[PDB]
Structure 1
Amino acid sequence: EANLRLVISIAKKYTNRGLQFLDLIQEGNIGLMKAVDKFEYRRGYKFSTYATWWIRQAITRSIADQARTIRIPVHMIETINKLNRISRQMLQEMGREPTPEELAERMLMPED
């Protein structure tokens, strides 16, 4: 209850058309349960930082592989999104259309 607002200010970032303007807040409100259970204030650190790690990634996963058509081990989910993040160079440095042939040097790896 004391943290229900911090769940909005983190979650609402990700609700940006992502799947809906709403639902990620309520999944953050369940990530907050694991956070409240493992709240090691006995290290010294603050619940702001706790939320910035754990509750943020509960908010991320709430529509990463949850609510999709498809779901995989998570390294192989967000790696598809590493490529979309890298494409921000491609679309302006090769800079007319995207080319997997450029992505091969930007990943140092074979396409297949």
Structure 2
Amino acid sequence: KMVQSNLRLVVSIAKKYMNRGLSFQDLIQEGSLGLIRAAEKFDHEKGYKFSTYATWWIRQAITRAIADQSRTIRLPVH
């Protein structure tokens, strides 16, 4: 539920990363791969929401995708 609940601000990552040469949706479903990768290692008794930590994953999970994703030649990040 909290997962499904924290599925609004995600649009921020979508907008910031439009589609990253892919698809708005795929740039949010891959962001969903985040969310879960928050909860778990979201950190309770922390002192504030994953609003500064959930994103964190989010944007580190998209990116990784995005560019893993999408040019039909994988690229090394280097």
TM-score (norm 1): 0.56
CA gap of 1:33–1:17, structure 2 versus 1, over 3 A, is closer
Q: 1:48 aligns with which of 51, 55, 63?
A: 51
Q: Is the 8 A contact 1:11 1:59 kept in 2?
A: no
Q: Does 1:37 align with 2:26?
A: no
Give, in angstroms, the shift of residue 3 of structure 1.
0.7
Please provide the CA RMSD for this pair: 1.9
| More helix per residue | 1
Q: 2:16 aligns with which of 13, 16, 23?
A: 13
Question: Could you tell me which residue of structure 1 aligns to residue 75 of structure 2?
Answer: 71
Question: Could you tell me which residue of structure 2 aligns to residue 57 of structure 1?
Answer: 60
Give, in angstroms, the shift of residue 17 of structure 1.
5.8
Length, aligned pairs only:
74
Q: Residue 50 of structure 1 aligns to which amino acid in structure 2? A: Y
Q: Residue 43 of structure 2 aligns to which amino acid in structure 1? A: E
Determine which structure has greater relative contact order: mean sequence separation of CA pairs < 8 Å that are 6+ residues apart, divided by chain length.
2
Could you report, residue by residue, the CA deviation over 1:27-50 in whole angstroms, capped at 9, with x for unpaired residues? 101111121111112222212111
